Amino acid sequence: LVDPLTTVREHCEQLEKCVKARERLELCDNRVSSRSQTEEDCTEELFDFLHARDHCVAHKLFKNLK
Amino acid sequence: LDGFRKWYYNAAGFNKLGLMRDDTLHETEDVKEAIRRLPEDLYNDRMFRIKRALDLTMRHQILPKDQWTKYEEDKFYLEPYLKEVIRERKEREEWAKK
Amino acid sequence: KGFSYLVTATTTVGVAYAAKNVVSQFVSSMSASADVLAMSKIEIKLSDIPEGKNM
Amino acid sequence: SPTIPSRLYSLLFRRTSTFALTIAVGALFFERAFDQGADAIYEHINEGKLWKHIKHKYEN
Amino acid sequence: SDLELHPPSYPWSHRGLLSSLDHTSIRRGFQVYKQVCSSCHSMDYVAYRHLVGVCYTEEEAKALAEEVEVQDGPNDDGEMFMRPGKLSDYFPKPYPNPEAARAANNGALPPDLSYIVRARHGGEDYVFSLLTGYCEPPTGVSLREGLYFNPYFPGQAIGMAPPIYTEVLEYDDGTPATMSQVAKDVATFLRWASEPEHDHRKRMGLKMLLMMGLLLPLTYAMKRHKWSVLKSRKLAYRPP
Amino acid sequence: REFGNLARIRHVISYSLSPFEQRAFPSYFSKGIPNVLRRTRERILRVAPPFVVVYLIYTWGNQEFEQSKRKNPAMYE
Amino acid sequence: MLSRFLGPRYRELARNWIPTAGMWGTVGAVGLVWATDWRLILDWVPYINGKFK
Amino acid sequence: MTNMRKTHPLFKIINHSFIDLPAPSNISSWWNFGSLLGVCLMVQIITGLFLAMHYTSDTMTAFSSVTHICRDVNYGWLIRYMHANGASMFFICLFLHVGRGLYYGSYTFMETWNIGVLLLFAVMATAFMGYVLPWGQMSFWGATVITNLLSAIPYIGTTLVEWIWGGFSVDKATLTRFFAFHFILPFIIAALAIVHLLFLHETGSNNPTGLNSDADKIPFHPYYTIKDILGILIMFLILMTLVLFFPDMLGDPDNYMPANPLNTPPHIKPEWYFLFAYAILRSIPNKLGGVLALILSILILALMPFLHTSKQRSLMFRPITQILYWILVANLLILTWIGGQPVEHPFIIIGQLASISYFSIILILMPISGIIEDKMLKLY
Amino acid sequence: WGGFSVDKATLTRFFAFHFILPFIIAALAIVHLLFLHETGSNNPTGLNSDADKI
Amino acid sequence: MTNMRKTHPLFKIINHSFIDLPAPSNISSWWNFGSLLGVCLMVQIITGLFLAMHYTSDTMTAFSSVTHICRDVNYGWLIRYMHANGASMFFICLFLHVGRGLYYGSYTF
Amino acid sequence: SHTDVKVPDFSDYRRAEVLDSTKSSKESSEAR
Ligand SMILES: CCCCCCCCCCCCCCCCCC(=O)OC[C@H](COP(=O)(O)OCCN)OC(=O)CCCCCCCCCCCCCCCCC
Ligand code: HEC
Ligand code: HEM
Ligand code: HEM
Ligand code: HEM
Ligand code: HEM
């Protein structure tokens, strides 16, 4: 069974500001993963990416559910 | 400060309703005593100007610009009576001191 | 005057004593009761928890 | 030819008792008419969602 | 992390100023709660007498009440006994005390889902975002057992595993039970359970708006009519 | 106290007409709009600067709060 | 506070009024300790301490 | 034949106070707020009376009783939401009443102003006890916070707050005594408001111009009767659209949970005006100092009539003090927003800057503004 | 009754009414004394007491 | 200087109502019952305020709350019995009040 | 003199049926 949430989310990562936040996300991801021992955890741009993605979802999801 | 005092006079707003400074100063006991000391024509003019002020403020309107009172012709009619009443009050106060 | 004012003074001493007792009565009544005095003095504590923990 | 508010004043509004009577009669009729109007606007703006709209699918 | 994710504003059918709830969605979210959410979360304030006339009919809600068992007493001999529930009975709690809830849910207490929309900021948007925002944690944080990542829960670590998924239950009307559909239905049902007076309140609001839009111009007309004699009064000063 | 001895008024003539003879809304727009912009212009420079600096302090506080919760780039290592 | 409370007449008025004002403050203090049963003052009076309050 | 309206004693009192009452003709919509406050007081009396008819004050049943009012009682949701949003509307009208008095110099009526300050005290205490009545999480925790503030008093506060608590924390005794006090206190408010109206009636009302209005007076009927009716309708519009469309806009979500002595919310955010009081408390970092700061921030209205150094009563003709007054309203709003916000930078520094600005404006800057205005107008 | 017999609703509403109605009694006692002050006070003889009043 | 007792508004109302009220000189002890009724009313106000301060109005807890007032609360038994006997004395004073009113022709007001 | 007192014009405030002074009332006053 297909999921409208997954299709809308895929369109959201296709959107421009979400994919810019996404590229910042994997950039800080290999920044953290390159270091071995640190107390560096970066949830902030993940929050930004989820914020933009879910904002676009809330704009363009509910027309599929009925 | 003639121009600055004129600007502050216009910005105060009581010239817009046709008042005077001595018209619009608040009534303390000395002020009521000096109003009682005002003569008949000045008292009648004061009360009519205040009544017109109440009417204009009720209607949320102001006088026309030509009918606005001007800084050059703002008579200070209540002032000498007010100074005399203040002098009498101060003299009574210093006699109460003694 | 001493006799009359001694009578008046004794009346107001009695009235003041009664009024102080009444007001102290009411403000002690609205104060803490026997239930909350009994439920606070003794606290049940055990040792059935592991080390480095909180309860 | 007297106008409409002229006839209302000549027939009902001059006497205070008749004024109160037409106030009460208009209160009844306006109460029901406004009830019908407001309800009709409500189920037209919310058609297909209320229990009185989806009721027939489970009543019978 | 003290930073929290603000839930987005979903365009609900009841989001409008005069728009009520979709009672079919309320019904669907009710069996979502019954077949999924009722095993952990209690419902202490919603009853079948509130269920009638909103999403189920009286006979359906009655039979739905007798499908579950309710403890009642005292007996003739003075004990408890299990009897079929009725419309007057409230929804059955899964645990008798919150200590049993914490024991069955490894130290986490599932709150009563009868005021959760009015209790959590964001409301049904927060509930939908919480139920649909489950994802793997980012590189940098490790969560111990019994804890799951959720960016919408404050503190980012929730005591719930994802409760819903695709085809988690079978709808009676044949609607495809996707995860988003199930979350939307249960969020609408939780909004109804938090505020059952929603439709009546909005109908009364429409009535109030129309009546006061009729009355305020008329009352202002009487105010200006009675005040007209002052506002057109003219003054003259005629000293000798 | 009551009407009759409130003030001493002389030579003052007041003219008024009946509410049924006159209108409840006499030129409500053609004279209302110049009057309301007159009042707004007269009393706009005493309220608007405090309210706009409240808006500036509000948005600056929110922005500084969000940068305070933002990550410090000093501690890469 | 005010300019009407200056000079020698009110000064000797306060001089005349200060002992009865001090006595009114004193009876206020005695009323306060008697009403509140203030132990910190009631343990120094010679007999009232036998009430244990 | 005689006139019953001046012959009958109850009727002559009603006539002399409400019917043939000489009032200034030019008073604006800001003078409707006293009648709005009285109407809202009566609305809360009736509404809370019904709430107490359907409400029980006991810790394990207070929240259940409130839920039973909301769900099982017919229109009980309407009654409770009317009560809450009408308390919000009551404090809105109270603040606009106080602002009217401050702007138009009505504080020169010393006895009326002091009775108004007493009314403000009683209304704030009543509303605090009403807020703790539904026994929510934030209700219980705000009660504990305010009682600890009372416990900040040296050598009396600990025993005084164990006395007020009826024990050692907020519990069943505290909830029941707060129910009794909340139910009873608006009747003292109504009696003291009768005293308020009597003290106002002794001297007459105040016009926005601040001048002698005896030259131009109108009866209270029917002008101010129909104006007050229109104001009542507008206030009912705002209140009822709040209740029926945004019943939680001025509310608190954490109040919709049962009170837990163990669990605490991450934030303690009471209602708007208590947010103001909480910010003026949180300004300076000491317990007794903050308590005195809150107490002086409320008593500063009673201290206001001694600070009037100007020769003109109202601020209609005083433009500099108009700027100072609107800056005062501005940092009232700022302090309310800081009370809403949590305790970080820059909310702290904005808090004490707003507090010092507010206190310095009321104490120092306003009489200096009046002196400067008088010396510009050749009155000093 | 608030229902079908004397129950919790009846007891709670009677509590509210019993709390509140003595204040209406107090206000009506104020009205009582106001009417009495308007009409004066009576004496046991039932006569005009204005000759001897203290 | 002014006479504050007759120039202050609340104070002149109090003076004209209760201080300088012209009262008949010959009124007997039956005329005290109005003041007794007012004082019993105030006593009922305060005493019932403390009772409702410690009272719960629910059928499961009304009787238990009354027992809690009479036993656990400090001298709440004295408060409850003062309330009950003050109600009884209120009706005693009411009956003697209406007895004065019927006997002495006070119903003409 | 008292005869100098002439009532000012009110045509900015009159209703539509009482604008002219050459038409008598009682055919419009009751309608108003
Ligand atoms: C000097 C200006 C001259 C303007 C001349 C304009 C043309 C005049 C001739 C044509 C007529 C146009 C219309 C006139 C309208 C009424 C007159 C007017 O606006 O006057 C200017 C007005 C009042 O002038 P006045 O008070 O005399 O200024 C003395 C200097 N203080 O003064 C003003 O408008 C200035 C107000 C400035 C207020 C700035 C406040 C900044 C700080 C706010 C802080 C708020 C709290 C923030 C939080 C604090 C704690 C963190
Ligand atoms: C048993 C596994 C549960 C199921 C089935 C559901 N919930 Fe739950 N819930 C459960 C626990 C143990 C907790 C507490 C976890 C914690 O970390 O505190 C919760 C909590 C919630 C909350 C509250 C979140 C908050 O911010 O307060 C919500 C809104 C919630 N759960 C939603 C929810 C819904 C809608 C469910 C039905 C689909 C549901 N949960 C099922 C345990 C369990
Ligand atoms: C429950 C709260 C209150 C009620 C019911 C109330 C009642 C009233 C009423 C009916 C009026 C007449 C309306 C008017 O003059 O505009 C009035 C005026 C007034 N009120 Fe209040 N009041 C309350 C609180 C306050 C407060 C908090 C203050 C001051 C801090 C205050 C001070 C005044 C003053 C000074 C006036 C005179 C205004 C004037 O003369 O124009 N009152 N009050
Ligand atoms: C005689 C008058 C009043 C009575 C009888 C009364 C009674 C009550 C009762 C029983 C409650 C609890 C019910 C509930 O919260 O659901 C309550 C709540 C409350 N009361 Fe009152 N009250 C009165 C006056 C006031 C006034 C004058 C104010 C404010 C100025 C006020 C403020 C509040 C508030 C804020 C609440 C909380 C409402 C909520 O939490 O939603 N009350 N009142
Ligand atoms: C229920 C509470 C009542 C209160 C608080 C109250 C209060 C008072 C007071 C203080 C007086 C003045 C005392 C005096 O003049 O001797 C008085 C007198 C009077 N009362 Fe009452 N009363 C109450 C009930 C009643 C009742 C039940 C009646 C009659 C059915 C009544 C009828 C009268 C009359 C006629 C007087 C005038 C006595 C006279 O002129 O000598 N009142 N009342
Ligand atoms: C605001 C005023 C009053 C309040 C708050 C109040 C409060 C209460 C409360 C809470 C109770 C139940 C507690 C208990 O009985 O143990 C009660 C009982 C009672 N009340 Fe009141 N009351 C007030 C005035 C009155 C008045 C004026 C009367 C009679 C004239 C009265 C007559 C009674 C009686 C007879 C009982 C029964 C006591 C018993 O059976 O033990 N009350 N009252």
mmCIF file with all atom_site columns, C-alpha atoms in Angstrom, chain E residues 51-118:
data_model
loop_
_atom_site.group_PDB
_atom_site.id
_atom_site.type_symbol
_atom_site.label_atom_id
_atom_site.label_alt_id
_atom_site.label_comp_id
_atom_site.label_asym_id
_atom_site.label_entity_id
_atom_site.label_seq_id
_atom_site.pdbx_PDB_ins_code
_atom_site.Cartn_x
_atom_site.Cartn_y
_atom_site.Cartn_z
_atom_site.occupancy
_atom_site.B_iso_or_equiv
_atom_site.pdbx_formal_charge
_atom_site.auth_seq_id
_atom_site.auth_comp_id
_atom_site.auth_asym_id
_atom_site.auth_atom_id
_atom_site.pdbx_PDB_model_num
ATOM 1  C CA . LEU E 1 51  ? -20.747 8.398   22.037 1.00 0.00 ? 51  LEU E CA 1
ATOM 2  C CA . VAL E 1 52  ? -24.438 8.309   21.074 1.00 0.00 ? 52  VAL E CA 1
ATOM 3  C CA . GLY E 1 53  ? -25.673 10.955  18.660 1.00 0.00 ? 53  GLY E CA 1
ATOM 4  C CA . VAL E 1 54  ? -22.177 11.990  17.532 1.00 0.00 ? 54  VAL E CA 1
ATOM 5  C CA . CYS E 1 55  ? -20.436 9.125   15.733 1.00 0.00 ? 55  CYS E CA 1
ATOM 6  C CA . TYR E 1 56  ? -22.445 5.984   16.546 1.00 0.00 ? 56  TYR E CA 1
ATOM 7  C CA . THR E 1 57  ? -26.165 5.411   16.863 1.00 0.00 ? 57  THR E CA 1
ATOM 8  C CA . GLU E 1 58  ? -27.773 4.314   20.125 1.00 0.00 ? 58  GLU E CA 1
ATOM 9  C CA . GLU E 1 59  ? -28.057 0.592   19.341 1.00 0.00 ? 59  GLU E CA 1
ATOM 10 C CA . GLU E 1 60  ? -24.527 0.388   17.912 1.00 0.00 ? 60  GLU E CA 1
ATOM 11 C CA . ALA E 1 61  ? -23.061 2.188   20.926 1.00 0.00 ? 61  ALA E CA 1
ATOM 12 C CA . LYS E 1 62  ? -25.084 -0.032  23.275 1.00 0.00 ? 62  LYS E CA 1
ATOM 13 C CA . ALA E 1 63  ? -23.802 -3.251  21.679 1.00 0.00 ? 63  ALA E CA 1
ATOM 14 C CA . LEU E 1 64  ? -20.301 -1.757  21.587 1.00 0.00 ? 64  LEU E CA 1
ATOM 15 C CA . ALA E 1 65  ? -20.684 -1.205  25.330 1.00 0.00 ? 65  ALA E CA 1
ATOM 16 C CA . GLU E 1 66  ? -21.776 -4.788  25.987 1.00 0.00 ? 66  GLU E CA 1
ATOM 17 C CA . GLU E 1 67  ? -18.829 -6.167  24.007 1.00 0.00 ? 67  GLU E CA 1
ATOM 18 C CA . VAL E 1 68  ? -16.573 -5.206  26.959 1.00 0.00 ? 68  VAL E CA 1
ATOM 19 C CA . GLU E 1 69  ? -16.868 -6.335  30.583 1.00 0.00 ? 69  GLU E CA 1
ATOM 20 C CA . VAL E 1 70  ? -17.240 -4.029  33.595 1.00 0.00 ? 70  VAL E CA 1
ATOM 21 C CA . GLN E 1 71  ? -16.697 -4.783  37.282 1.00 0.00 ? 71  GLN E CA 1
ATOM 22 C CA . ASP E 1 72  ? -19.723 -3.959  39.439 1.00 0.00 ? 72  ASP E CA 1
ATOM 23 C CA . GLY E 1 73  ? -20.850 -4.494  43.008 1.00 0.00 ? 73  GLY E CA 1
ATOM 24 C CA . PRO E 1 74  ? -21.435 -5.171  45.788 1.00 0.00 ? 74  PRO E CA 1
ATOM 25 C CA . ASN E 1 75  ? -22.938 -8.640  45.329 1.00 0.00 ? 75  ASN E CA 1
ATOM 26 C CA . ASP E 1 76  ? -25.685 -10.213 47.459 1.00 0.00 ? 76  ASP E CA 1
ATOM 27 C CA . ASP E 1 77  ? -22.932 -12.016 49.376 1.00 0.00 ? 77  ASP E CA 1
ATOM 28 C CA . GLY E 1 78  ? -20.819 -8.844  49.318 1.00 0.00 ? 78  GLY E CA 1
ATOM 29 C CA . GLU E 1 79  ? -18.251 -9.207  46.531 1.00 0.00 ? 79  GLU E CA 1
ATOM 30 C CA . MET E 1 80  ? -17.551 -7.864  43.056 1.00 0.00 ? 80  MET E CA 1
ATOM 31 C CA . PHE E 1 81  ? -18.767 -9.421  39.820 1.00 0.00 ? 81  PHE E CA 1
ATOM 32 C CA . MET E 1 82  ? -18.213 -8.872  36.109 1.00 0.00 ? 82  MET E CA 1
ATOM 33 C CA . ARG E 1 83  ? -21.243 -7.709  34.120 1.00 0.00 ? 83  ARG E CA 1
ATOM 34 C CA . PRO E 1 84  ? -21.670 -6.489  30.532 1.00 0.00 ? 84  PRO E CA 1
ATOM 35 C CA . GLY E 1 85  ? -21.182 -2.751  30.290 1.00 0.00 ? 85  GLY E CA 1
ATOM 36 C CA . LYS E 1 86  ? -23.878 -0.320  29.242 1.00 0.00 ? 86  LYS E CA 1
ATOM 37 C CA . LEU E 1 87  ? -24.283 3.216   27.904 1.00 0.00 ? 87  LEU E CA 1
ATOM 38 C CA . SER E 1 88  ? -23.922 4.744   31.375 1.00 0.00 ? 88  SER E CA 1
ATOM 39 C CA . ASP E 1 89  ? -20.519 3.126   31.967 1.00 0.00 ? 89  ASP E CA 1
ATOM 40 C CA . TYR E 1 90  ? -17.317 5.032   31.279 1.00 0.00 ? 90  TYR E CA 1
ATOM 41 C CA . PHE E 1 91  ? -14.493 3.689   29.140 1.00 0.00 ? 91  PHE E CA 1
ATOM 42 C CA . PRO E 1 92  ? -12.574 0.862   30.857 1.00 0.00 ? 92  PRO E CA 1
ATOM 43 C CA . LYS E 1 93  ? -9.182  1.778   32.257 1.00 0.00 ? 93  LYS E CA 1
ATOM 44 C CA . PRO E 1 94  ? -6.346  -0.572  31.222 1.00 0.00 ? 94  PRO E CA 1
ATOM 45 C CA . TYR E 1 95  ? -4.669  -0.423  34.635 1.00 0.00 ? 95  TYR E CA 1
ATOM 46 C CA . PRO E 1 96  ? -6.158  0.051   38.116 1.00 0.00 ? 96  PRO E CA 1
ATOM 47 C CA . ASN E 1 97  ? -3.475  2.425   39.430 1.00 0.00 ? 97  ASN E CA 1
ATOM 48 C CA . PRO E 1 98  ? -0.752  4.534   37.771 1.00 0.00 ? 98  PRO E CA 1
ATOM 49 C CA . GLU E 1 99  ? 1.844   2.335   39.498 1.00 0.00 ? 99  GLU E CA 1
ATOM 50 C CA . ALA E 1 100 ? 0.636   -0.632  37.436 1.00 0.00 ? 100 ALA E CA 1
ATOM 51 C CA . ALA E 1 101 ? 0.810   1.577   34.336 1.00 0.00 ? 101 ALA E CA 1
ATOM 52 C CA . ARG E 1 102 ? 4.431   2.453   35.111 1.00 0.00 ? 102 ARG E CA 1
ATOM 53 C CA . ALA E 1 103 ? 5.176   -1.221  35.805 1.00 0.00 ? 103 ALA E CA 1
ATOM 54 C CA . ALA E 1 104 ? 3.729   -2.342  32.463 1.00 0.00 ? 104 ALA E CA 1
ATOM 55 C CA . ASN E 1 105 ? 5.320   0.612   30.636 1.00 0.00 ? 105 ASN E CA 1
ATOM 56 C CA . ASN E 1 106 ? 8.846   0.438   32.195 1.00 0.00 ? 106 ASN E CA 1
ATOM 57 C CA . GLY E 1 107 ? 8.560   3.582   34.322 1.00 0.00 ? 107 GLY E CA 1
ATOM 58 C CA . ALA E 1 108 ? 6.571   5.809   31.950 1.00 0.00 ? 108 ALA E CA 1
ATOM 59 C CA . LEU E 1 109 ? 3.013   6.856   32.776 1.00 0.00 ? 109 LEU E CA 1
ATOM 60 C CA . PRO E 1 110 ? 0.637   7.077   29.791 1.00 0.00 ? 110 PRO E CA 1
ATOM 61 C CA . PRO E 1 111 ? -1.561  10.117  30.453 1.00 0.00 ? 111 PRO E CA 1
ATOM 62 C CA . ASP E 1 112 ? -5.337  10.123  30.245 1.00 0.00 ? 112 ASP E CA 1
ATOM 63 C CA . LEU E 1 113 ? -6.282  10.854  26.629 1.00 0.00 ? 113 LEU E CA 1
ATOM 64 C CA . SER E 1 114 ? -9.436  12.802  27.490 1.00 0.00 ? 114 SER E CA 1
ATOM 65 C CA . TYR E 1 115 ? -7.860  16.268  27.739 1.00 0.00 ? 115 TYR E CA 1
ATOM 66 C CA . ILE E 1 116 ? -4.618  15.671  25.854 1.00 0.00 ? 116 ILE E CA 1
ATOM 67 C CA . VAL E 1 117 ? -5.497  18.021  22.978 1.00 0.00 ? 117 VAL E CA 1
ATOM 68 C CA . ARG E 1 118 ? -6.417  20.842  25.363 1.00 0.00 ? 118 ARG E CA 1
#
